[PDB]
Amino acid sequence: PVGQFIPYSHHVTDTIISTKNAEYLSVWKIDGRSHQSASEADVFQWIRELNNTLRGISSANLSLWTHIVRRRVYEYPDAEFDNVFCRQLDEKYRESFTGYNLMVNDLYLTVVYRPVPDQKKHRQESCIKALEDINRTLGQSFKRYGAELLSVYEKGGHAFSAPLEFLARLVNGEHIPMPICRDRFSDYMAVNRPMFSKWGEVGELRSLTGLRRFGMLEIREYDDATEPGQLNVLLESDYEFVLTHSFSVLSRPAAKEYLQRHQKNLIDARDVATDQIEEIDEALNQLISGHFVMGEHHCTLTVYGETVQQVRDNLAHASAAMLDVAVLPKPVDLALEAGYWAQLPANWQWRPRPAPITSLNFLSFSPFHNFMSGKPTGNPWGPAVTILKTVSGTPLYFNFHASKEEEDATDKRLLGNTMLIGQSSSGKTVLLGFLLAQAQKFKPTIVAFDKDRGMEISIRAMGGRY
Amino acid sequence: TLGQSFKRYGAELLSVYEKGGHAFSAPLEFLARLVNGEHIPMPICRDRFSDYMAVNRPMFSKWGEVGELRSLTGLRRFGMLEIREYDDATEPGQLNVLLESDYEFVLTHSFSVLSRPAAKEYLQRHQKNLIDARDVATDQIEEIDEALNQLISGHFVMGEHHCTL
Amino acid sequence: PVGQFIPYSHHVTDTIISTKNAEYLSVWKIDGRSHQSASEADVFQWIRELNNTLRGISSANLSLWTHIVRRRVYEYPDAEFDNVFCRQLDEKYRESFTGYNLMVNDLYLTVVYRPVPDQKKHRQESCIKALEDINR
């Protein structure tokens, strides 16, 4: 049955979805900062600032779910120019664009609250208020992260809800603009209901776009200190995965119980003391100060595609990079039948091995999105051009209108002015002509203020005057 | 003692690579190459390693004419030879013919040195097997006695061995 | 390579081989006299001569196993000449001699004497002398 293991029902606000068991949540789309264009001190500053942000964020049964999902973008349209040589440039570019493994990653952060007729109403209103201030604080905190709260796809026809749609890509793996219905929407999500084997080898997906098959990979035995950007190797990885970190914040009594458990596992181990309980009480004092806040965590990787063998190979590459980053993967048995549901933000019951972790060692995995522009589609216009050859990287999907520092956040449709910095005609001419050719998808009213034969041949070859 | 003996021999005791990055144990990677057939660097962990070598678990045919292994570069096939039939007058440079072999092979020699009463009982049993059957006049039964001489004199010790390519 | 109870050993000497059944053996390569160049009267003379050789051949548990084997020429190390005209001409000629069932036939003879802790030694030593005179 569908709606089993799926809790959601979009019945509270724009931004906050409910679950079928009294839990309330929202999602953030995150264009996280480029890990490549920074010093390591910048990385440590960012993780420290995030621990300051979550330091203010309490333990009131709160939980975060980060989702790192990479996808082949089929949504890039074909170019049409009504012009022959521009079409030749596009097609020569696209045969040059053969290869490049056209899957771009995306970063999502789900904020889930649990409250641990009129009484129900007052409880709901209070947690609405709390999560609203939480989201305001996060948006102020993520100002250099380009994050966007997802609620309000009205007027795209009639009132879509992009958060549910995002959860659809969790459960269906294809981008479906799910609409709003007068139903407890948990039954309405599982469009491609998957199948699981009797043995946990692989799972199957019955999509009308073709049958897919997915394999799962639990992650355990963590390096107790971490490199700050440790899991960044998978952003080049070629499998179209979804990677999920769960983190449910524990209480300070539960934290002290877990540090007592750490003592019972460490100095009440096999009569050995290897100086491991030295900073446990220091971390206790720091989480009393508010720093080392710990919570339950599991992480899971899920990779799908055709051809069960290729699923096995992508699991092999994934485990290889896991052993490269000194963390032990575990291929999943029949529990992946549960484990798929473990990807969901409100599915604590199906988490395989919730292990406690500090906030810093949690944040030392996630937030480092490699650069890729947020318009492969969905702009005020088409996407302009897929700039290829990010060095050891992905296609870029270049465009113009990107969000800025939001003083008078509307200001336009979206501001998109650009500036070139560099010597005269040192490739400047050919890229400017490339951008004019790609802009000729959209038939702009082009005014060109050139100095000295500034692509007069090309501009007149497109039918311009010059 | 080995480092003393291999001073003219370019050797290296492994397992010093730990805390490299975050503590890979060097020889396990070698053992990963022994099992998964790839340079899979194995970090240390808080668990018993026996369950963690098999990154690319090999498989075998139903007949045993070839094996298979979904390597990191894909599914490959393994052929294997076991050893019989020695040239007993051993040569110093016998297997140097495999140096130009264009096939990246694996050569496994084994040795488990048997103690002098064990080898003495073995040589007595082998001489007993030599004198058992008819048409056994090879005049090499006394080379078992020469083997007993060199064994109890301690110069050269037998041990159980198998070799496999 | 499971033995079918195949009687075999190398327990005698250089030129005589053994069995487990105490049977001792010798092999001869025969690149024999070409019958496609000779008269048939010569053939009758040769058969009469080898019949007289059989008259010199005893009945003391002797057995004779002749084998005639037709194998291909795969063991020929065919190679280049390091001479341009020769490497052209002879290799075009080896292509011009396109096989035509190129299979060498050879002929071999097996002499097995059978001698009907020192009893076996004296049996096989008498067999050594017997097979030596036979091979002579």
Side-chain angles (χ1 to χ4, degrees), chain A residues 1-22 24-58 60 62-79 81-135 137-150 152-154 156-160 162-164 166-173 175-197 199-200 202-205 207-217 219-220 222 224-225 228-235 238-256 258-259 261-270 272-281 283-332 334-336 338-346 348-369 371-374 376-388 390-411 413-435 437-456 458 460-466, chain B residues 1-14 16-18 20-24 26-28 30-37 39-61 63-64 66-69 71-81 83-84 86 88-89 92-99 102-120 122-123 125-134 136-145 147-165, chain C residues 1-22 24-58 60 62-79 81-135:
Chain A
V2 312
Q4 219 166 324
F5 326 111
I6 304 169
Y8 317 106
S9 75
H10 186 293
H11 291 84
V12 182
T13 67
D14 296 339
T15 71
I16 306 134
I17 304 169
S18 68
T19 69
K20 71 198 179 183
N21 193 10
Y24 310 92
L25 75 158
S26 155
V27 292
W28 290 90
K29 181 167 170 305
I30 295 196
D31 315 327
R33 308 209 51 174
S34 174
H35 69 282
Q36 302 174 358
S37 318
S39 73
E40 320 208 306
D42 307 327
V43 184
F44 181 68
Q45 283 144 18
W46 292 332
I47 301 179
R48 200 192 44 202
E49 285 154 325
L50 266 296
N51 276 293
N52 299 337
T53 292
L54 285 158
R55 180 147 179 181
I57 295 162
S58 72
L62 297 142
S63 63
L64 305 192
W65 292 74
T66 37
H67 296 242
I68 311 95
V69 43
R70 54 186 310 120
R71 56 213 195 77
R72 293 190 183 86
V73 173
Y74 313 106
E75 310 83 62
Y76 186 71
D78 188 12
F81 298 106
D82 303 332
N83 202 304
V84 287
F85 80 105
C86 320
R87 178 169 324 274
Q88 295 162 1
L89 299 194
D90 164 74
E91 285 151 346
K92 277 160 180 294
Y93 196 65
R94 282 175 39 193
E95 60 84 13
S96 81
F97 195 59
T98 314
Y100 291 85
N101 322 342
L102 297 200
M103 38 181 79
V104 306
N105 54 340
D106 213 13
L107 209 57
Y108 297 85
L109 170 59
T110 303
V111 196
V112 184
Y113 177 87
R114 289 177 288 188
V116 179
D118 48 347
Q119 317 170 321
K120 317 175 162 198
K121 186 131 197 176
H122 179 63
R123 285 158 189 186
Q124 180 164 318
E125 284 147 346
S126 47
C127 59
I128 285 157
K129 198 64 194 50
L131 277 192
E132 271 162 326
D133 310 336
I134 281 173
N135 288 280
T137 308
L138 284 178
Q140 292 155 313
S141 82
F142 282 124
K143 274 301 168 176
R144 306 161 309 146
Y145 280 87
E148 195 184 353
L149 185 61
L150 322 164
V152 213
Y153 278 171
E154 60 179 18
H158 332 301
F160 283 98
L164 280 172
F166 159 71
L167 315 179
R169 311 210 43 176
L170 307 181
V171 294
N172 289 279
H175 175 238
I176 308 173
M178 317 278 287
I180 308 177
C181 174
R182 292 162 177 185
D183 193 303
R184 183 211 303 111
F185 207 74
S186 78
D187 56 352
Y188 275 5
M189 290 195 58
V191 172
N192 297 321
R193 181 182 176 274
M195 286 173 296
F196 315 117
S197 69
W199 299 93
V202 73
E204 307 182 292
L205 200 52
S207 155
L208 56 89
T209 70
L211 309 186
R212 267 182 182 165
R213 274 170 210 96
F214 60 97
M216 293 203 70
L217 188 60
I219 296 182
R220 50 198 301 275
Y222 317 108
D224 302 333
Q230 188 178 1
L231 292 182
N232 283 329
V233 62
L234 299 178
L235 316 167
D238 204 22
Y239 340 112
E240 275 188 305
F241 58 79
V242 42
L243 177 68
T244 324
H245 313 284
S246 59
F247 184 71
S248 64
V249 183
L250 294 163
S251 86
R252 276 182 184 168
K256 292 171 196 170
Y258 259 119
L259 297 180
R261 286 182 183 196
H262 281 307
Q263 293 163 348
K264 293 285 163 180
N265 297 314
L266 276 179
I267 49 182
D268 302 300
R270 303 169 172 180
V272 70
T274 79
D275 317 319
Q276 287 191 62
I277 317 191
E278 290 287 334
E279 212 254 338
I280 291 174
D281 312 327
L284 175 63
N285 303 307
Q286 285 288 336
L287 63 91
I288 285 164
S289 88
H291 198 276
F292 279 85
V293 184
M294 302 181 62
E296 295 182 346
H297 157 82
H298 93 289
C299 178
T300 179
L301 188 44
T302 303
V303 41
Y304 34 71
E306 62 274 62
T307 314
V308 200
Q309 200 44 64
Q310 284 182 307
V311 174
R312 289 149 176 178
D313 311 329
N314 283 344
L315 292 155
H317 295 66
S319 44
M322 282 308 92
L323 287 168
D324 199 312
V325 304
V327 190
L328 178 143
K330 175 59 178 180
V332 188
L334 80 170
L336 70 92
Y340 192 93
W341 313 120
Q343 299 165 255
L344 277 304
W348 300 267
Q349 320 90 347
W350 304 98
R351 298 172 300 182
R353 280 313 169 280
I357 194 172
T358 67
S359 81
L360 210 168
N361 272 327
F362 158 72
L363 291 172
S364 64
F365 290 145
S366 41
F368 295 137
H369 176 232
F371 178 59
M372 197 278 320
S373 88
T377 182
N379 229 357
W381 59 288
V385 49
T386 70
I387 289 189
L388 50 86
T390 299
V391 178
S392 77
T394 182
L396 197 155
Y397 298 88
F398 177 75
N399 62 288
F400 286 84
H401 308 308
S403 316
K404 68 170 185 67
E405 295 183 315
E406 276 191 353
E407 176 216 351
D408 185 30
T410 308
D411 216 339
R413 320 182 180 190
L414 180 54
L415 293 165
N417 290 359
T418 187
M419 183 159 301
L420 273 73
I421 291 307
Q423 294 174 354
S424 198
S425 167
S426 317
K428 166 155 58 183
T429 162
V430 303
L431 60 88
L432 275 179
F434 197 64
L435 294 204
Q438 296 310 298
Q440 262 308 122
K441 295 163 175 174
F442 317 101
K443 307 184 177 317
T445 317
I446 304 176
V447 173
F449 176 78
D450 296 277
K451 172 177 183 176
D452 207 358
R453 291 305 186 272
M455 298 141 289
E456 160 170 351
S458 317
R460 293 168 161 191
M462 307 153 104
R465 180 175 189 167
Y466 203 102
Chain B
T1 308
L2 293 153
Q4 293 181 357
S5 62
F6 295 129
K7 198 165 192 174
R8 306 296 200 87
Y9 204 62
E12 176 164 357
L13 173 62
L14 225 66
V16 302
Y17 188 67
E18 294 82 13
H22 328 288
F24 313 104
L28 277 71
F30 158 77
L31 297 168
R33 188 66 193 265
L34 187 152
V35 176
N36 296 302
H39 190 133
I40 303 184
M42 303 292 312
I44 73 163
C45 77
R46 272 170 320 278
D47 198 356
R48 278 185 310 272
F49 277 119
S50 287
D51 306 16
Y52 306 116
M53 308 289 107
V55 183
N56 303 50
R57 176 190 176 267
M59 293 159 308
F60 327 99
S61 47
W63 308 97
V66 77
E68 44 196 40
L69 195 150
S71 79
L72 309 190
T73 329
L75 183 45
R76 297 303 102 65
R77 305 306 196 107
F78 275 76
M80 186 178 289
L81 307 173
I83 196 55
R84 302 188 50 204
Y86 288 150
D88 205 83
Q94 198 156 16
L95 303 169
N96 69 326
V97 298
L98 317 165
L99 290 167
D102 207 348
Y103 299 108
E104 321 175 63
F105 55 91
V106 163
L107 171 68
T108 75
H109 280 278
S110 56
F111 199 85
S112 44
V113 47
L114 314 169
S115 167
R116 301 194 189 177
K120 188 171 188 166
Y122 179 79
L123 287 177
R125 280 192 307 276
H126 194 272
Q127 171 166 89
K128 188 61 177 48
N129 298 313
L130 270 182
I131 68 164
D132 265 345
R134 290 174 302 173
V136 293
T138 65
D139 297 311
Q140 303 176 240
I141 305 170
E142 301 189 7
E143 281 183 333
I144 318 292
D145 301 317
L148 279 165
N149 295 339
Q150 298 162 302
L151 162 75
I152 307 160
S153 75
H155 296 66
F156 313 100
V157 196
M158 279 202 186
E160 269 183 20
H161 158 76
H162 52 86
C163 176
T164 302
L165 195 146
Chain C
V2 188
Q4 315 169 0
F5 325 116
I6 308 162
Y8 263 143
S9 43
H10 209 301
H11 289 185
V12 186
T13 179
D14 293 353
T15 66
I16 314 164
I17 325 297
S18 166
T19 64
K20 312 142 160 163
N21 282 349
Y24 313 113
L25 312 91
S26 154
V27 188
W28 285 74
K29 181 181 184 185
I30 311 178
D31 304 313
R33 178 65 189 272
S34 44
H35 278 56
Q36 308 186 259
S37 63
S39 90
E40 295 190 347
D42 312 335
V43 189
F44 311 144
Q45 289 152 5
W46 296 329
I47 274 183
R48 178 182 52 101
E49 280 158 9
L50 294 164
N51 267 295
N52 298 331
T53 318
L54 290 157
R55 293 179 56 192
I57 276 162
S58 69
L62 197 50
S63 63
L64 184 138
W65 292 71
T66 163
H67 296 66
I68 294 157
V69 301
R70 190 179 164 83
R71 83 183 191 278
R72 303 162 177 252
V73 300
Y74 290 151
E75 53 178 23
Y76 185 66
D78 197 358
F81 284 84
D82 198 68
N83 186 272
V84 46
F85 311 132
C86 289
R87 178 203 329 181
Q88 281 147 355
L89 183 46
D90 276 327
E91 293 180 356
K92 283 180 305 184
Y93 174 69
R94 297 175 312 108
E95 177 266 357
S96 315
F97 196 92
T98 313
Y100 324 118
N101 293 335
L102 172 51
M103 289 175 282
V104 162
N105 181 23
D106 205 359
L107 312 98
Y108 299 83
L109 192 59
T110 306
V111 197
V112 186
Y113 199 94
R114 166 191 207 195
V116 293
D118 303 331
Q119 319 171 321
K120 41 190 178 180
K121 304 183 185 187
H122 306 340
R123 283 190 189 273
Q124 74 175 77
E125 182 184 356
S126 46
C127 185
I128 282 154
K129 305 171 177 192
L131 269 194
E132 271 306 309
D133 304 357
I134 285 158
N135 277 315

